[PDB]
Each structure stands twice: as C-alpha cells, then as structure tokens.
Design a protein around this motif. Structure first.
Motif, PDB file in Angstrom:
ATOM      1  N   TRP A   1      58.656  40.111  55.600  1.00 20.05           N
ATOM      2  CA  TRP A   1      58.288  41.479  55.931  1.00 20.05           C
ATOM      3  C   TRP A   1      58.632  42.466  54.808  1.00 20.05           C
ATOM      4  O   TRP A   1      57.802  43.311  54.473  1.00 20.05           O
ATOM      5  CB  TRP A   1      58.851  41.908  57.295  1.00 20.05           C
ATOM      6  N   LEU A   2      59.825  42.340  54.218  1.00 19.56           N
ATOM      7  CA  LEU A   2      60.218  43.146  53.047  1.00 19.56           C
ATOM      8  C   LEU A   2      59.240  42.907  51.896  1.00 19.56           C
ATOM      9  O   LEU A   2      58.816  43.824  51.206  1.00 19.56           O
ATOM     10  CB  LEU A   2      61.623  42.728  52.594  1.00 19.56           C
ATOM     11  N   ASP A   3      58.908  41.635  51.723  1.00 19.04           N
ATOM     12  CA  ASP A   3      57.881  41.152  50.798  1.00 19.04           C
ATOM     13  C   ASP A   3      56.575  41.877  51.132  1.00 19.04           C
ATOM     14  O   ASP A   3      55.978  42.531  50.278  1.00 19.04           O
ATOM     15  CB  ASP A   3      57.748  39.628  50.976  1.00 19.04           C
ATOM     16  N   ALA A   4      56.146  41.757  52.386  1.00 17.39           N
ATOM     17  CA  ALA A   4      54.846  42.278  52.818  1.00 17.39           C
ATOM     18  C   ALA A   4      54.749  43.809  52.739  1.00 17.39           C
ATOM     19  O   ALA A   4      53.779  44.340  52.216  1.00 17.39           O
ATOM     20  CB  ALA A   4      54.531  41.799  54.220  1.00 17.39           C
ATOM     21  N   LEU A   5      55.759  44.506  53.250  1.00 15.08           N
ATOM     22  CA  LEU A   5      55.749  45.961  53.265  1.00 15.08           C
ATOM     23  C   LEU A   5      55.687  46.504  51.853  1.00 15.08           C
ATOM     24  O   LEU A   5      55.105  47.558  51.603  1.00 15.08           O
ATOM     25  CB  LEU A   5      56.985  46.518  53.973  1.00 15.08           C
ATOM     26  N   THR A   6      56.282  45.768  50.930  1.00 10.95           N
ATOM     27  CA  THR A   6      56.350  46.208  49.555  1.00 10.95           C
ATOM     28  C   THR A   6      54.969  46.250  48.886  1.00 10.95           C
ATOM     29  O   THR A   6      54.812  46.892  47.849  1.00 10.95           O
ATOM     30  CB  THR A   6      57.341  45.329  48.768  1.00 10.95           C
ATOM     31  N   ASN A   7      53.963  45.619  49.482  1.00  5.88           N
ATOM     32  CA  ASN A   7      52.620  45.653  48.898  1.00  5.88           C
ATOM     33  C   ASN A   7      52.149  47.082  48.664  1.00  5.88           C
ATOM     34  O   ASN A   7      51.435  47.348  47.690  1.00  5.88           O
ATOM     35  CB  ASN A   7      51.582  44.891  49.743  1.00  5.88           C
ATOM     36  N   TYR A   8      52.536  47.988  49.564  1.00  7.07           N
ATOM     37  CA  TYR A   8      52.124  49.379  49.464  1.00  7.07           C
ATOM     38  C   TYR A   8      52.635  49.984  48.161  1.00  7.07           C
ATOM     39  O   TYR A   8      51.895  50.696  47.461  1.00  7.07           O
ATOM     40  CB  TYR A   8      52.610  50.192  50.672  1.00  7.07           C
ATOM     41  N   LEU A   9      53.892  49.687  47.838  1.00  9.83           N
ATOM     42  CA  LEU A   9      54.484  50.131  46.578  1.00  9.83           C
ATOM     43  C   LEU A   9      53.793  49.477  45.372  1.00  9.83           C
ATOM     44  O   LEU A   9      53.397  50.148  44.428  1.00  9.83           O
ATOM     45  CB  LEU A   9      55.979  49.810  46.573  1.00  9.83           C
ATOM     46  N   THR A  10      53.638  48.163  45.421  1.00  3.57           N
ATOM     47  CA  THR A  10      52.954  47.446  44.352  1.00  3.57           C
ATOM     48  C   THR A  10      51.566  48.014  44.086  1.00  3.57           C
ATOM     49  O   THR A  10      51.220  48.275  42.929  1.00  3.57           O
ATOM     50  CB  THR A  10      52.816  45.951  44.679  1.00  3.57           C
ATOM     51  N   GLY A  11      50.776  48.207  45.146  1.00  2.00           N
ATOM     52  CA  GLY A  11      49.409  48.715  45.000  1.00  2.00           C
ATOM     53  C   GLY A  11      49.376  50.095  44.365  1.00  2.00           C
ATOM     54  O   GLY A  11      48.460  50.428  43.608  1.00  2.00           O
ATOM     55  N   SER A  12      50.396  50.889  44.672  1.00  2.00           N
ATOM     56  CA  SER A  12      50.500  52.227  44.147  1.00  2.00           C
ATOM     57  C   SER A  12      50.758  52.220  42.641  1.00  2.00           C
ATOM     58  O   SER A  12      50.591  53.262  41.994  1.00  2.00           O
ATOM     59  CB  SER A  12      51.609  52.999  44.863  1.00  2.00           C
ATOM     60  N   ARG A  13      51.144  51.060  42.098  1.00  2.00           N
ATOM     61  CA  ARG A  13      51.509  50.907  40.679  1.00  2.00           C
ATOM     62  C   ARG A  13      50.563  50.055  39.811  1.00  2.00           C
ATOM     63  O   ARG A  13      50.834  49.861  38.629  1.00  2.00           O
ATOM     64  CB  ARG A  13      52.934  50.345  40.576  1.00  2.00           C
ATOM     65  N   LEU A  14      49.457  49.568  40.368  1.00  2.00           N
ATOM     66  CA  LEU A  14      48.521  48.731  39.606  1.00  2.00           C
ATOM     67  C   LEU A  14      47.357  49.523  39.036  1.00  2.00           C
ATOM     68  O   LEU A  14      46.612  50.149  39.786  1.00  2.00           O
ATOM     69  CB  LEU A  14      47.945  47.628  40.491  1.00  2.00           C
ATOM     70  N   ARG A  15      47.187  49.493  37.717  1.00  2.00           N
ATOM     71  CA  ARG A  15      45.922  49.924  37.117  1.00  2.00           C
ATOM     72  C   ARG A  15      44.871  48.864  37.412  1.00  2.00           C
ATOM     73  O   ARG A  15      45.113  47.670  37.215  1.00  2.00           O
ATOM     74  CB  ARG A  15      46.029  50.087  35.608  1.00  2.00           C
ATOM     75  N   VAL A  16      43.706  49.307  37.871  1.00  2.00           N
ATOM     76  CA  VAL A  16      42.641  48.407  38.280  1.00  2.00           C
ATOM     77  C   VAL A  16      41.376  48.734  37.496  1.00  2.00           C
ATOM     78  O   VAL A  16      41.010  49.897  37.380  1.00  2.00           O
ATOM     79  CB  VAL A  16      42.381  48.535  39.790  1.00  2.00           C
ATOM     80  N   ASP A  17      40.720  47.706  36.952  1.00  2.00           N
ATOM     81  CA  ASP A  17      39.473  47.895  36.186  1.00  2.00           C
ATOM     82  C   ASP A  17      38.264  48.154  37.098  1.00  2.00           C
ATOM     83  O   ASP A  17      38.372  48.079  38.328  1.00  2.00           O
ATOM     84  CB  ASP A  17      39.208  46.731  35.193  1.00  2.00           C
ATOM     85  N   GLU A  18      37.130  48.490  36.488  1.00  2.00           N
ATOM     86  CA  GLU A  18      35.872  48.706  37.225  1.00  2.00           C
ATOM     87  C   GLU A  18      35.449  47.481  38.063  1.00  2.00           C
ATOM     88  O   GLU A  18      34.886  47.622  39.152  1.00  2.00           O
ATOM     89  CB  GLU A  18      34.758  49.135  36.254  1.00  2.00           C
ATOM     90  N   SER A  19      35.752  46.289  37.556  1.00  2.00           N
ATOM     91  CA  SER A  19      35.450  45.034  38.250  1.00  2.00           C
ATOM     92  C   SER A  19      36.315  44.779  39.502  1.00  2.00           C
ATOM     93  O   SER A  19      35.924  43.999  40.369  1.00  2.00           O
ATOM     94  CB  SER A  19      35.571  43.860  37.266  1.00  2.00           C
ATOM     95  N   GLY A  20      37.483  45.416  39.588  1.00  2.00           N
ATOM     96  CA  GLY A  20      38.375  45.273  40.749  1.00  2.00           C
ATOM     97  C   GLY A  20      39.631  44.442  40.519  1.00  2.00           C
ATOM     98  O   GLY A  20      40.513  44.417  41.383  1.00  2.00           O
ATOM     99  N   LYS A  21      39.728  43.771  39.369  1.00  2.00           N
ATOM    100  CA  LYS A  21      40.916  42.979  39.034  1.00  2.00           C
ATOM    101  C   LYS A  21      42.067  43.877  38.564  1.00  2.00           C
ATOM    102  O   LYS A  21      41.856  44.860  37.849  1.00  2.00           O
ATOM    103  CB  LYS A  21      40.595  41.933  37.954  1.00  2.00           C
ATOM    104  N   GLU A  22      43.280  43.542  38.998  1.00  2.00           N
ATOM    105  CA  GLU A  22      44.509  44.161  38.500  1.00  2.00           C
ATOM    106  C   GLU A  22      44.688  43.862  37.022  1.00  2.00           C
ATOM    107  O   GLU A  22      44.585  42.701  36.611  1.00  2.00           O
ATOM    108  CB  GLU A  22      45.693  43.582  39.269  1.00  2.00           C
ATOM    109  N   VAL A  23      44.955  44.892  36.223  1.00  2.00           N
ATOM    110  CA  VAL A  23      45.143  44.674  34.782  1.00  2.00           C
ATOM    111  C   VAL A  23      46.522  45.077  34.237  1.00  2.00           C
ATOM    112  O   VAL A  23      46.864  44.702  33.115  1.00  2.00           O
ATOM    113  CB  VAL A  23      44.001  45.294  33.905  1.00  2.00           C
ATOM    114  N   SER A  24      47.319  45.807  35.017  1.00  2.00           N
ATOM    115  CA  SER A  24      48.584  46.335  34.510  1.00  2.00           C
ATOM    116  C   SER A  24      49.451  46.853  35.644  1.00  2.00           C
ATOM    117  O   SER A  24      48.939  47.391  36.615  1.00  2.00           O
ATOM    118  CB  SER A  24      48.301  47.450  33.492  1.00  2.00           C
ATOM    119  N   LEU A  25      50.762  46.681  35.522  1.00  2.00           N
ATOM    120  CA  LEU A  25      51.705  47.220  36.489  1.00  2.00           C
ATOM    121  C   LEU A  25      52.545  48.279  35.807  1.00  2.00           C
ATOM    122  O   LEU A  25      53.349  47.954  34.947  1.00  2.00           O
ATOM    123  CB  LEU A  25      52.617  46.111  37.016  1.00  2.00           C
ATOM    124  N   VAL A  26      52.381  49.540  36.193  1.00  2.00           N
ATOM    125  CA  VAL A  26      53.193  50.620  35.608  1.00  2.00           C
ATOM    126  C   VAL A  26      54.617  50.608  36.156  1.00  2.00           C
ATOM    127  O   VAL A  26      54.844  50.216  37.294  1.00  2.00           O
ATOM    128  CB  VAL A  26      52.587  52.015  35.843  1.00  2.00           C
TER     129      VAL A  26
END
Ligand code: MET
Length: 517
Positions: free
Chosen positions: A237-262
């Motif tokens: 659950w700590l793992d899972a809930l943290t997705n919100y934080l992770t998503g908030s930190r990913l640069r995403v390209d036009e194609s939709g793939k994650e390219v960088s974690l700030v």
C-alpha cells in the motif's frame, strides 16, 4: 496559485483482467481532466497498475507463470482496455517501474529519518485480497472457495488470515490530532460528505500504528525491498500510494513513455493531487494513511479525495460500447449513478436514457436547429429583439456554466449532467412553443431570433457536455459549424461567443440512433 491540475485514478491490482470497476474509476478521472482542459487549464491525469504484493504473486502462481511475465501481460490488458475506451489520460504508471521504486525508497528513507518508522510486530488479522490489516471487530464467520468454515472480512467478504510477524511499523497513532485538524480545516477535502464524516468518526476513535513492511517469504519475494534491510519488503500500500508522488515527478514524451524522474516535485507543478478519484473500498488508505505519510515527510496534502459508490476490486463495457456507442455508455454510467450502488444498470434503462435524453432531448434538438426546413440559409442568423420568453431561456443558458462549473469542481458529475439537461429540456420547450417550422413562412424576422437562441443554447450545453461526450460533441460542433477556437476556453462559456453569419457544416446521418424497446 496557477499549477498543473493533477487528477488521478487508483492504480489497479493486476491479479485479474480489467472490468467495469476500473473502467468506471478511470472514466471519472478522465472526465474531470477533460473538463479542466476545456476550461483552458494545464492538466495531468494519471492512471495505472499496482503490480507487487502477495495477492498478485499468488495469482501468478495460480496461473503457473512468473510474476514478471504475468504483471506485464495484465498491465498490457489494462492499457488496451483504456485505449479502447478512448480516454485521454496523460500517463499510465506501473509500480514495477524502476523510477517508481526509486521514489518509494526516497519516501521510506524520509519517514525513517523523521523517526516515524520503527521495528515492531504485527499480530492480527489480514485480508490478502484487500491487502488490508483488520481488527477483530472487522471480521466474522464465513466460507472459503472450498466451502469450509473460516473467518472473513466485514469490509469485503474475502477470507482473512492471522499474521504474526516482526515488521517495520509506521507511527500512525502520532498523526491522529493533525489528521483531525486537516479534516476540519478543509471540510470539502473528502466527497461525498457522508464519507467524510465516516473517516472523521474512525480517526476520532483512535489510530493504531501501521505495519509498512512484511517478511520477504510472505510476499513470495515480489515487492520492493526495504532500504538497508533485504529481509523485509515494503507494504504494497505504501508502495501503491506512492505512485501519485512518482507520477507527479515524471517527464513524459509525446509518445507517452516516461523519460526522466525529477528530484523535486515542484519542478513539474503537479503535486499534490487536486483530485484523487477512488472507490469507497479504499477510502481509509487515501484519507488516513496517505496524508499521514505526507505529513511525516513534510509533503503537501491533496486537495480533494472523491470516493464513488462502487467497489473497484457479467457486464463488459467494451462490448456494450460497441452495441450502444462509447459516449452513450459513458453518459449512462455517469448519469445513472451518483454516490451509491442504487443505480439501475440494465439494458432497459440504458436504452431508456439513450432514447429519452441523448436522442429525444439532445439529438432531436441538434437536427431541428440545423435542419434545411427550419434553418434555410444554413447559418447562424442575426437575432431581432428579445421577448421576455426569449430572455427567460437566455438567462438559463447564461447561468448554466457557473452552475455546471461548481458541480464539476465538487466533484459531482451526475449533477453537472442533470443541470445541462435541465437547460436542454427548457430549450426543447421553447422550440415547441415558438414552432420555428411555422415561422419560416409566417414571420422570418421572428425565426431569426428563435433559431439563434436555439443554436446558442445547443452550443453552450454541448460545450459543458464535451467532457462526457467527447466524440459526439465534436460531431455536434461540426454540424453547427462552430470554429475550433470556440470549442474550448472559459471565454466561450459566455452567451453569444459565436457570431451570426457563421456557416453550418455540411450534412451527410444521425447523432444518436434509437433502439428497440
Ligand atoms: C494507490 S490506489 C491502490 C488501489 C488497489 N491496488 C486496488 O486495486 O484496490
């Protein structure tokens, strides 16, 4: 504070194929995101899959294939489903992602440093299916897949097992006062209200500390290791809930793939979430655990958690969408149910709403005001003077955006739909009273006025319905000949934004086809 509007769905367990539950949760997330994009705001909508933990690993072991293979396959099924459903989600996150795991370790370490994680034991009940610790008051007698006597959860009905493990513990008990301050200072932070009250009553009663790790054997080694202790894995659950934080930190390209974690969430202006969409089944984790973790780490708290009336953990949405139309099905799901299970989801009712609201109310009106018989010049006419009856209708159309806006922001999408359709019913009534078909021969000057108000009412109602009916709205605007620029932006919520003399689009051809009763 102008930030990027951040709306999320839950991330779904991959033990099983996608079904209506996940489709519905993600639909709500999508509709909110769409509305804010229509408003002209920057939006980042997030959905994804929850891939670790005992439950998934045991599903993989049941199908006799490796957890990596299994998760990857099912994650693909979820992605395919959400493409088929024609959502506009900005990113699809998987907890198996290496950048996600990195964030989980950063967060865990932060909690540990703040003194909020200690080594202890959990001795008590657990539902593997819900990934949930339960107290003895939350269990009762029931049956297992065999039919043997056993214990089951009162929350969910799934089998519970007693667990006795040395675990890392989060000091949740220390966050009761601050959580209560949070709920009271932000009385709209949990919707609907009766669910907010439920959370408060629960936290008032007291909070135990929470197990945030499990012994690695228990999870079949399918989880994120605890930093500095390979014998333990991080609670799913700590793992899972943290997705919100992770998503908030990913640069995403036009194609939709994650390219960088700030490194710093503020770089992307998303965290914290403006709206977390969840089902009622996972309210405690989002309204209690999640904010407690964020409070420990000094991170900002989400603005709103909205918990809808169905559990997300035979009715095939792709199949029904192929039968009745995609926008239609979306309309039905959002219109039929407010925050309850008390929705009537039968074909009878689907057809009833399709025929009555979509075809008879909305579709009929679109054809009337674009018809060659009535709209003989195929253009937006220039209105003459307005009667009191004209002005009564105009007032409704002018008031509609403010009313719909508030509902969308609660959020309460059912009420937003009802508000728009109240105005659509009113426009039909007006058209029936004015009988524009007769005015073409009798009073052309009067028809200009009637036709113009009708067209404008249709445009404005359609604009506010565009997050619910994303494809059909485009068809409608094309018929009305509304320029692209006027299909978006709060400036175009205003009455009269499309000037007279605008030409209608060519005709071919129905908008919503009615079905056998
Ligand atoms: C952080 S949201 C987690 C939701 C959970 N995986 C479920 O499917 O119910």
């Amino acid at each position: 504070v102008e930030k990027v509007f951040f709306v999320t769905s839950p991330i779904y367990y991959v033990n099983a194929a996608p079904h209506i539950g996940h489709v519905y949760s993600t639909l709500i997330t999508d509709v909110i995101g769409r509305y804010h994009r229509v408003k002209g705001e920057r939006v980042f909508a997030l959905t994804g899959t929850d891939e670790h933990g005992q439950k998934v690993a045991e599903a993989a072991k049941q199908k006799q294939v490796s957890p990596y293979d299994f998760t990857t396959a099912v994650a693909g099924e979820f992605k395919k489903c959400f493409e088929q459903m024609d959502y506009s989600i900005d990113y699809f996150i998987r907890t198996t992602n290496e950048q996600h795991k990195a964030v989980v370790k950063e967060l865990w370490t932060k909690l540990e440093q703040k003194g909020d994680i200690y080594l202890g034991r959990y001795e008590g009940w657990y539902s593997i299916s819900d990934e949930s610790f339960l107290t003895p008051q939350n269990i009762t007698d029931g049956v297992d897949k065999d039919g043997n006597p056993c214990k089951v959860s009162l929350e969910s009905g799934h089998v519970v097992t007693w667990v006795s493990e040395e675990n890392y513990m989060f000091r949740l008990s220390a966050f009761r006062e601050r959580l209560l301050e949070w709920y009271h200072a932000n009385p709209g932070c949990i919707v609907p209200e009766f669910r907010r009250r439920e959370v408060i009553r629960a936290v008032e009663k007291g909070l135990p500390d929470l197990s945030v790790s499990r012994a690695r054997a228990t999870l079949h080694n399918w989880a994120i290791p605890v930093p500095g202790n390979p014998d333990h894995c991080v609670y799913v659950w700590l793992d899972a809930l943290t997705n919100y934080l992770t998503g908030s930190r990913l640069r995403v390209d036009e194609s939709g793939k994650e390219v960088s974690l700030v490194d710093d969430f503020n770089e992307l202006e998303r965290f914290p979430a403006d709206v977390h969409v969840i089902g009622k089944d996972i309210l405690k984790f989002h309204a209690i655990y999640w904010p407690a973790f964020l409070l420990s780490a000094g991170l900002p708290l989400p603005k709103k958690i909205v918990a809808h009336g169905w559990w997300t953990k035979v009715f095939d949405p792709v199949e029904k969408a192929e039968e009745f139309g995609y926008d239609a099905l979306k309309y039905f799901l959002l219109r039929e149910s407010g925050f309850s299970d008390d929705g009537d989801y039968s074909d009878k009712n689907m057809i009833a709403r399709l025929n009555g609201e979509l075809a008879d109310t909305l579709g009929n009106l679109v054809m009337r005001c674009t018809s060659a018989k009535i709209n003989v010049n195929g253009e937006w006419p220039s209105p003459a003077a307005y009667t009191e009856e004209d002005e009564s209708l105009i007032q409704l159309i002018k008031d509609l955006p403010g009313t719909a806006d508030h509902y969308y922001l609660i959020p309460d999408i059912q009420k937003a739909i009802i508000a728009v359709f109240d105005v659509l019913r009113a426009i039909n009534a007006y058209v029936t009273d004015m009988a524009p078909w007769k005015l073409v021969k009798t009073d052309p000057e009067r028809l200009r006025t009637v036709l113009y108000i009708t067209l404008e009412g249709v445009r404005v109602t359609t604009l506010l319905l565009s997050p619910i009916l994303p494809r059909k709205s485009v068809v409608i605007f094309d018929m009305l000949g509304v320029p692209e620029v006027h299909r978006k932006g709060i400036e175009n919520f205003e009455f009269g934004a499309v000037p007279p003399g605008t030409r209608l689009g060519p005709a071919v051809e129905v908008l919503f086809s009615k079905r056998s009763t």
